Amino acid sequence: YGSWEIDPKDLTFLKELGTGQFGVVKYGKWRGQYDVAIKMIKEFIEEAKVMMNLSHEKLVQLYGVCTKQRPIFIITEYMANGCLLNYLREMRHRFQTQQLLEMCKDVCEAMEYLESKQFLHRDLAARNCLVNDQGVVKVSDFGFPVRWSPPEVLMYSKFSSKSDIWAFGVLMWEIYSLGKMPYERFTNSETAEHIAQGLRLYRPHLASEKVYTIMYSCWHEKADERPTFKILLSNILDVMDEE
Ligand SMILES: Cc1nc(Nc2ncc(C(=O)Nc3c(C)cccc3Cl)s2)cc(N2CCN(CCO)CC2)n1
């Protein structure tokens, strides 16, 4: 794979990171200079290939792969603050609501980019975003989530740009509720029934009525009445200016 093939001996491994959703992820350095995360998989056909064609400041950036050797490596930029869901549940951060809104805006920018590329993420949720050292949120794992799915997906499997819009609204709720599970008091069956009847996530305490109006707009029962990510972006930026 061209300049995407990385020389494994340009890699050092500095610390262990996980095994519970991946296959060993490690923090290491590339070319003695760049912090990377290194994903070692085992017996890929699609993940890096997706990641080779997409590039945005708000999408976790592929640096390269190791394909000519043992277990395959995928190497990306390193996200020092880990998954967004864990970051939000860490109470020491004591976030201000302007920080929470900026997290929404980060993800919204990534999704507007993907939308412009006609690419559907399909599993957008806080667990699939990561956070770097500066607190910037980036969309990840883009290479069944009942609580992030609109009625047309639960009932008919009708995926579309508007089903990513729905999940993004639920992701804003996850941010403003500091990492709560959506529909925390319900089973998956109950969530599906209750969403099909028109009930929606309540306004988080930290979300202003303007912010809640944005997330609520993602949840129109008619998919074609939901905004695009371009419109959600402009709306979020408007709220940031109003403060
Ligand atoms: C599991 C984990 N990842 C971290 N950072 C990452 N950056 C990049 C990663 C990654 O997976 N990229 C990637 C992708 C997206 C696709 C294909 C291939 C790859 Cl390689 S994972 C940080 C972290 N921390 C846990 C503990 N911490 C405080 C909480 O206690 C902060 C440090 N934990």
Cα–Cα distance measured from residue 127 to residue 38, given in angstroms and rounded to the nearest whole number: 19
- H/E element holding 161? helix 161-176
Our CA angle for 116, 232, 52, nearest 5°, is: 30
Q: How far apart are alpha carbons 197 and 62 in whole angstroms?
A: 42
Distance CA 71, CA 82 (A): 24
What technique determined this structure? X-ray
36: left (phi > 0), else alpha (psi -120 to 50), else beta? beta
CB 112 within 8 A of CB 136: no
Q: Does the C-beta of 66 come closer than 6 Å to ligand 1?
A: no
**Burial class, 35, CB count within 10 angstroms (exposed 0-12 / middle 13-18 / buried 19+):** middle
Q: Rounded to whole angstroms, how far apart are CA atoms 161 and 230? A: 12
The answer, yes or no, to whether any atom of ligand 1 lies below 6 A from the CB of 86, is yes
Residue ranges for the binding site? 17-25, 39, 76-79
Could you give the residue numbers annotated as active site? 123
Q: For the chain, which domains are there?
A: 1-80 (3.30.200.20), 81-243 (1.10.510.10)
Q: Nearest 5 degrees, angle CA 87-CA 91-CA 96? A: 85
